[PDB]
Scaffold this motif. Structure first.
Motif, PDB file in Angstrom:
ATOM      1  N   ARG A 128      10.827  -4.446  -0.357  1.00 35.86           N
ATOM      2  CA  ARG A 128      11.264  -5.699  -0.991  1.00 35.86           C
ATOM      3  C   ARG A 128      11.388  -5.469  -2.497  1.00 35.86           C
ATOM      4  N   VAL A 129      10.426  -4.764  -3.102  1.00 34.06           N
ATOM      5  CA  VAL A 129      10.536  -4.441  -4.550  1.00 34.06           C
ATOM      6  C   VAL A 129      11.837  -3.667  -4.814  1.00 34.06           C
ATOM      7  N   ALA A 130      12.170  -2.696  -3.960  1.00 37.76           N
ATOM      8  CA  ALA A 130      13.361  -1.820  -4.112  1.00 37.76           C
ATOM      9  C   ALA A 130      14.626  -2.672  -4.043  1.00 37.76           C
ATOM     10  N   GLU A 131      14.669  -3.622  -3.119  1.00 43.67           N
ATOM     11  CA  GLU A 131      15.837  -4.527  -2.946  1.00 43.67           C
ATOM     12  C   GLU A 131      15.999  -5.374  -4.193  1.00 43.67           C
ATOM     13  N   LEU A 132      14.890  -5.888  -4.728  1.00 44.93           N
ATOM     14  CA  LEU A 132      14.961  -6.752  -5.914  1.00 44.93           C
ATOM     15  C   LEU A 132      15.358  -5.912  -7.116  1.00 44.93           C
ATOM     16  N   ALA A 133      14.799  -4.711  -7.288  1.00 46.88           N
ATOM     17  CA  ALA A 133      15.114  -3.832  -8.435  1.00 46.88           C
ATOM     18  C   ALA A 133      16.618  -3.514  -8.425  1.00 46.88           C
ATOM     19  N   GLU A 134      17.216  -3.374  -7.241  1.00 45.10           N
ATOM     20  CA  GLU A 134      18.669  -3.010  -7.146  1.00 45.10           C
ATOM     21  C   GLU A 134      19.545  -4.210  -7.520  1.00 45.10           C
TER      22      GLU A 134
ATOM     23  N   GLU B  67      10.090  12.347  -7.655  1.00 50.86           N
ATOM     24  CA  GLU B  67      10.829  13.031  -6.566  1.00 50.86           C
ATOM     25  C   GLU B  67      10.762  12.208  -5.281  1.00 50.86           C
ATOM     26  N   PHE B  68      10.003  11.115  -5.252  1.00 48.82           N
ATOM     27  CA  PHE B  68       9.812  10.312  -4.028  1.00 48.82           C
ATOM     28  C   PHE B  68      10.590   9.017  -4.155  1.00 48.82           C
ATOM     29  N   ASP B  69      10.975   8.470  -3.012  1.00 48.87           N
ATOM     30  CA  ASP B  69      11.789   7.235  -2.996  1.00 48.87           C
ATOM     31  C   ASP B  69      11.450   6.432  -1.742  1.00 48.87           C
ATOM     32  N   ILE B  70      11.039   5.198  -1.938  1.00 44.50           N
ATOM     33  CA  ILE B  70      10.642   4.276  -0.854  1.00 44.50           C
ATOM     34  C   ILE B  70      11.818   4.179   0.148  1.00 44.50           C
ATOM     35  N   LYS B  71      13.064   4.295  -0.325  1.00 41.40           N
ATOM     36  CA  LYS B  71      14.244   4.076   0.572  1.00 41.40           C
ATOM     37  C   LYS B  71      14.234   5.093   1.711  1.00 41.40           C
ATOM     38  N   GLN B  72      13.568   6.233   1.559  1.00 37.29           N
ATOM     39  CA  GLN B  72      13.596   7.356   2.547  1.00 37.29           C
ATOM     40  C   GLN B  72      12.437   7.243   3.531  1.00 37.29           C
ATOM     41  N   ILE B  73      11.399   6.477   3.215  1.00 38.77           N
ATOM     42  CA  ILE B  73      10.150   6.488   4.010  1.00 38.77           C
ATOM     43  C   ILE B  73      10.188   5.413   5.094  1.00 38.77           C
ATOM     44  N   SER B  74      10.025   5.807   6.348  1.00 34.71           N
ATOM     45  CA  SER B  74      10.005   4.899   7.514  1.00 34.71           C
ATOM     46  C   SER B  74       8.583   4.558   7.952  1.00 34.71           C
ATOM     47  N   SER B  75       7.677   5.519   7.919  1.00 34.63           N
ATOM     48  CA  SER B  75       6.267   5.329   8.305  1.00 34.63           C
ATOM     49  C   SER B  75       5.446   6.356   7.533  1.00 34.63           C
ATOM     50  N   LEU B  76       4.340   5.935   6.955  1.00 38.82           N
ATOM     51  CA  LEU B  76       3.523   6.877   6.199  1.00 38.82           C
ATOM     52  C   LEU B  76       2.632   7.698   7.115  1.00 38.82           C
TER      53      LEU B  76
ATOM     54  N   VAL C 174       6.994   5.568  -5.770  1.00 33.56           N
ATOM     55  CA  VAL C 174       8.128   5.446  -4.807  1.00 33.56           C
ATOM     56  C   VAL C 174       9.234   4.529  -5.311  1.00 33.56           C
ATOM     57  N   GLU C 175       9.064   3.793  -6.394  1.00 31.11           N
ATOM     58  CA  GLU C 175      10.124   2.872  -6.888  1.00 31.11           C
ATOM     59  C   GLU C 175      10.930   3.597  -7.964  1.00 31.11           C
ATOM     60  N   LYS C 176      12.185   3.895  -7.694  1.00 32.04           N
ATOM     61  CA  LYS C 176      12.997   4.689  -8.633  1.00 32.04           C
ATOM     62  C   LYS C 176      13.771   3.702  -9.496  1.00 32.04           C
ATOM     63  N   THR C 177      13.074   2.981 -10.356  1.00 34.15           N
ATOM     64  CA  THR C 177      13.651   1.946 -11.230  1.00 34.15           C
ATOM     65  C   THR C 177      12.924   1.990 -12.581  1.00 34.15           C
ATOM     66  N   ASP C 178      13.624   1.680 -13.648  1.00 35.15           N
ATOM     67  CA  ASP C 178      12.986   1.454 -14.975  1.00 35.15           C
ATOM     68  C   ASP C 178      12.703  -0.033 -15.198  1.00 35.15           C
ATOM     69  N   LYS C 179      13.039  -0.923 -14.270  1.00 28.55           N
ATOM     70  CA  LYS C 179      12.754  -2.354 -14.386  1.00 28.55           C
ATOM     71  C   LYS C 179      11.244  -2.524 -14.355  1.00 28.55           C
ATOM     72  N   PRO C 180      10.679  -3.407 -15.186  1.00 31.28           N
ATOM     73  CA  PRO C 180       9.225  -3.576 -15.162  1.00 31.28           C
ATOM     74  C   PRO C 180       8.725  -4.096 -13.811  1.00 31.28           C
ATOM     75  N   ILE C 181       7.632  -3.491 -13.357  1.00 28.67           N
ATOM     76  CA  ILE C 181       6.919  -3.882 -12.141  1.00 28.67           C
ATOM     77  C   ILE C 181       5.460  -4.046 -12.590  1.00 28.67           C
ATOM     78  N   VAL C 182       4.942  -5.230 -12.358  1.00 32.15           N
ATOM     79  CA  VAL C 182       3.578  -5.576 -12.822  1.00 32.15           C
ATOM     80  C   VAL C 182       2.790  -6.059 -11.610  1.00 32.15           C
ATOM     81  N   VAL C 183       1.594  -5.511 -11.407  1.00 34.67           N
ATOM     82  CA  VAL C 183       0.667  -5.945 -10.316  1.00 34.67           C
ATOM     83  C   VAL C 183      -0.499  -6.667 -10.986  1.00 34.67           C
ATOM     84  N   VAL C 184      -0.861  -7.831 -10.453  1.00 38.55           N
ATOM     85  CA  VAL C 184      -1.878  -8.666 -11.102  1.00 38.55           C
ATOM     86  C   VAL C 184      -2.726  -9.350 -10.056  1.00 38.55           C
TER      87      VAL C 184
END
Lengths: 330, 330, 330, 330
Positions: free
Chosen positions: B74-80, B205-214, B106-116
């Protein structure tokens, strides 16, 4: 005129050797016997009459409950002797905090007991062990140390053996307490700023003289997607209590709660500690309904400290209410 | 004029409720929906155009790997999206540090992501969540936050999601890093004093878009008299890597080494972390012969962080030398 | 039966107001009267019978020795009253640590005395003052607080008034001690982990009942290229002792030593403190020959604390050996 | 081929001597020449081609502005030489933080510059200077150190010269930054975890090559019942700027504000710092109306650091808006 101090050696980095002076971090622990430790600090003869004994010669990560019992029983024999004024234990850093807390609970003596290690071996440039051992002997010889419980004397500090922990890797300031150092030792003199509040040594209900065996206690970690696997396996291989090293305030995953209820009904004590170890404590009935489940909270004690208290406590009681009292008084 | 910020709610204490205003520590997490959180800080409208989504409603101690992937996707979709300038995630404290590090990898974006999160529920006197959320939105709306990796904004601080950890229980200063805060946020303004050094987000080197199951990764604790039981049981029940939460510098009991050699021979990665979490790091080939055993050290990463990096790393490689490089770069 | 607690209001941020809820750091101190402060925490009635008095209404950076004497004398009158069980003082943060130490020296009572402030005004989002005041009344009402000396209860901690200091700006964890918190206060309950070691309250040689005036004491700072100007100016305008806020271990520039020798011969006491305030202490005869010059070292006390102890001590003695004893016992 | 490192000796405890091995805290500084320091670490030859120069031989508490310029100009000459890869400065601890920050502002080079001292003389048991000097040379010879600004390498850490401060007396962990260490140095290897955010060295607008004499700047302390005496006297004796070491968030007593308004009107810059030095910063227009009064806030900088920046800044500007920009960028 000078105090009679006995040094009981167990091994560790303080007795270790590296390949060169630049090897402060890569070394072999437990290479030098107690006589070489004493010979390496000739200045000890200025501050005390020192005698050394080798109790064991181990890397402290490999210590066993039989080792703790052997050390505890020898400390008690020396403490009963009129010829002994104080005791120093030289020890590896990895489980120094476990040994120090164990002795704090089971040694019913006001005589000073000091546990000391080093972050660098004696072969290293700027090795910390020489002054740590000098300070340990200074503190073990000082009247101000009587009745203060087990002490740890690294980094020019006087730390309570109850709640000092190995908190920083590599650096000589490794051992810290959430509740601060109690004092400092500088040029052989002790300076006190706080006193212990919790039960120890002479005011303890526990006594090594009445302990011939320790109940098996194990520790399982909490994290994202943790399952009940480790908890069940540890109990199946003999754990009489499990220390839960939870996230946050000893929180338990919904994936783990049912197994912990089943283990508790099967007679395994469930003690909630945490891996949040720089300050605060685990509050009863906050993250889990400890009264409903008949569980125990470890208060401020980190997992490895909670294991020590649980093991000592269960030599006397398996009553969860009594164990909770113990976790609130020691 | 105002930045477009999306708040992704996941539950936690910040969404919690207790029985009375004096109940700062005893509450139920994950009770309030994201629209109630937003409505509790009407001043958000002064600093950003905010929209809320409810991704999940959990106590973070019960998070799963599938929850991480749902949130990360969901973060990846919003960042795009051109319509999103920054992202805030409201989260329980217990595993906040795990989520923040995961997103940093895993998030390949320069958009700010903040966890609180918050340490007190919104029902408590002097609840911390209102200002924490305002600050998170302020940081997520600030051009200075672009390219800094994932940030955590509690206690007026800007912390790196890489190495901030829940270190103090109960108190609002719970989140700390061995390497310090990178900045502070005060009256809506960000003040920076340090930059990240390690790889993150756009340089990963990692990207959430490629990962199906950890991949399954578990953690076992080191302490006095530990045995190989937890390590073997976790591997038997599917662990592809084991994080060893060792004493000291990732040290391994002589009772455990043979099991870890057998597990590595059977294809399980062995990663040496520690429960010595206030500073320092685990040094390769110091306490154990990692090269001889084909083991990995977790560098400065605590066990739960090392688990997150090991899971992401093993989506790309089973080569222990590449895993060690990743543990030295991220 | 509930304890009778009197709240003595003096002003500060806890009685402060800002222009909007986002103003956590930009506000005006000392706007709200004691009855409005108490009315803002109606839950106080659940833990004590409270009444309020307005002693003064100031920003604590502007406190005078006449204000300390007024507050000290009023505390003493209440402590002598059979109708008073505990006393809370609401206070600005800037000099909170000076007032708390002053009261610890001069109030010969075992009744709890708690000093409390806030880092945010009560108008702010996530204001800290309400729970701080609740906690102060909780601790002032608790039998465990008797005989523990003056206490400060911010950030869920029980800090000693002796050696707590304002150490961090902006953040709610502002008040720290080198010797750690002594305890915590959570959901109205006090949890103790350390006791005071130093002389205070009932074991103090000083008594506000016998003090009608305070000697003038001033502080001068040490730094690169410092000259003797401030020291001589402060003495010329009435200082009876000078606190030297030295670099390092109370070190004195060679440019300043001669002036300090001349000032000591002129009857000004010279007390070496430092601006090295996170730990350790100033050692007598180490950086300067205190015995030869007839100077005093402030031990672990920071410059403003040393000023308070010097001023109280000089109500009784101007003997430099006596002052050094006092700096070693309090 | 090894890096060419020049050691510039200035004195200090690292060059000090005590009467016996147990004298870790009582010693004479500045006794040993640079050749003896180098001879005491024969392992330096394994990591670099070292040569030593004696720039001065002082106890750093007695450093002058002309000493800073002499050292700064020698560093500049060496940085301009093709035969020099790195520079180490051996220094007293007392004003190490002032020298390191000064060099960080005025040396327009990317070549590594390391400032190092010790808390124990080389004559003491467990003396820290040998490994600190080895580590300084290791960091000065490391490609990773290029472009990082001035570094301080004590206690196994890599600290920024900007904001590291002497924070703990006696103990070897004395040097701390509110913003954390940037790295560590272990067995000759550098491990980085943060980068600087503030302007330094090659990106500085200042240059040692242009400065002939630094302007006079002095520091006055804020405390209960402080008067305007020290501020006025320091200005009367030539201060071009006054660093106000205020209580709290750089707060100014109502007894002092009028004098500071008068001094500003007469051309003296007024810079609000604080003695609240573990974290946070001084916020413009919060405690005082800086815009109305044309005053400057020192941001996070402690008083002695603020003095260094004010001196350097005033070699370029007397515009209070430019001085405030400098205090926000450096």
């Amino acid at each position: 005129k000078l105090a009679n101090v006995v040094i009981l050696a167990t091994g560790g980095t303080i007795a270790g050797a590296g390949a060169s002076a630049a090897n402060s971090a890569t070394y072999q622990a437990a290479k030098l016997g107690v006589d070489k430790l004493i010979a390496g600090v000739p200045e000890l003869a200025d501050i005390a009459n020192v005698r050394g004994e080798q109790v064991m010669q181990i890397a402290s990560e490999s210590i066993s409950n039989d080792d703790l019992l052997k050390l505890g029983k020898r400390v008690a024999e020396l403490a009963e002797s009129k010829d002994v004024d104080g005791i120093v234990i030289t020890h590896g850093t990895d489980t120094l905090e476990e040994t120090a807390f164990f002795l704090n609970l089971v040694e019913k003596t006001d005589k000073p007991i000091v546990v000391v290690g080093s972050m660098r071996p004696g072969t290293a440039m700027s090795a910390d062990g020489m002054l740590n051992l000098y300070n340990a002997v200074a503190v073990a010889s000082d009247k101000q140390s009587r009745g203060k419980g087990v002490l740890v004397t690294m980094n020019d500090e006087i730390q309570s053996g109850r709640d000092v922990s190995m908190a920083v890797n590599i650096k000589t300031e490794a051992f810290k307490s959430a509740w601060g150092p109690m004092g400092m030792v500088v040029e052989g003199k002790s300076y006190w700023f706080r006193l212990p509040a919790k039960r120890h040594t002479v005011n303890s209900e526990f006594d090594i003289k009445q302990i011939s065996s320790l109940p098996q206690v194990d520790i399982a970690y909490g994290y994202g997607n943790v399952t009940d696997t480790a908890y069940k396996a540890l109990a199946q291989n003999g754990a009489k209590a499990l220390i839960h090293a939870g996230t946050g305030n000893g929180s338990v995953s919904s994936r783990v709660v049912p197994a912990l209820q089943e283990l508790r009904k099967n007679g395994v004590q469930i003690i909630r500690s945490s891996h949040v170890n720089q300050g605060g404590f685990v509050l009863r009935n906050a993250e889990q309904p400890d009264d409903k489940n008949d569980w125990v909270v470890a208060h401020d004690l980190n997992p490895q400290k909670a294991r020590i208290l649980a093991m000592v406590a269960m030599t006397k009681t398996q009553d969860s209410k009594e164990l909770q009292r113990i976790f609130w008084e020691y």
